[PDB]
Design a protein around this ligand. Structure first.
Ligand SMILES: O=P(O)(O)O[C@H]1[C@H](OP(=O)(O)O)[C@@H](OP(=O)(O)O)[C@H](OP(=O)(O)O)[C@@H](OP(=O)(O)O)[C@H]1OP(=O)(O)O
Length: 178
């Protein structure tokens, strides 16, 4: 594989300082402080090395989850203000081609922002998934049993955000047709 270069190439300036420190966590796995193990020598992985890695991994997990929250909530706010704008536009034109034009460009920008956030969620989820399996393969100590459900854990906004994205798709189809 070539994730180290893949993640670096797929960096958006909007999320630039909030991506996984994949190279940083990979370097931490090589920094073992236990007894020297012979192989036809490299130091062994300890409880202290494990505690250091988990703390560094959790700090990276919070950094990603914080950026995922701020952007999704801003998108949910952007959907809410645009939904009202479409509602009074469809309402007034029931009781102008330019009005649909401005709304079509505004709603499509949110769809692109949803995809760019989905790309960030994708590249980061793969990042943690790959580094956790790398830890289990290099050290021998398994981190996957509790970290698989920690990454699959759904935040508070996720249920309301997914419904907003569903409405956004319906709002865009309504302005494009009329
Ligand atoms: O191809 P790169 O992006 O330059 O990075 C590779 C690649 O790492 P990632 O795919 O996880 O980013 C190898 O991983 P695999 O091909 O095994 O999936 C990994 O190999 P090992 O895990 O077996 O070590 C190797 O590591 P390294 O050379 O540090 O031992 C590492 O290379 P670099 O870290 O030197 O870029």
């Amino acid at each position: 594989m070539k994730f180290g270069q893949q993640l670096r190439s797929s960096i958006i300036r909007e999320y630039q300082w909030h991506y996984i420190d994949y190279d940083g966590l990979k370097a931490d796995l090589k920094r073992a402080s236990g007894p020297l193990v012979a192989s036809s020598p490299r130091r062994e992985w300890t409880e202290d090395d494990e505690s250091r890695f988990v703390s560094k991994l959790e700090a990276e997990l919070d950094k990603v989850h914080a950026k995922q929250q701020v952007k999704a909530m801003e998108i949910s706010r952007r959907i809410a203000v645009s939904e009202r704008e479409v509602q009074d536009v469809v309402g007034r034109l029931q009781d102008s081609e330019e009005e649909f034009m401005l709304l079509e460009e505004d709603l499509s920008d949110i769809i692109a922002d949803v995809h760019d956030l989905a790309k960030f969620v994708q590249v980061n989820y793969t990042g943690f998934y790959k580094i956790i399996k790398k830890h289990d393969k290099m050290t021998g100590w398994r981190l996957k049993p509790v970290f698989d459900t920690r990454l699959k854990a759904k935040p508070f906004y996720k249920e309301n955000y997914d419904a907003s994205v569903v409405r956004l798709s319906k709002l865009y189809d309504l302005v494009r047709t009329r």
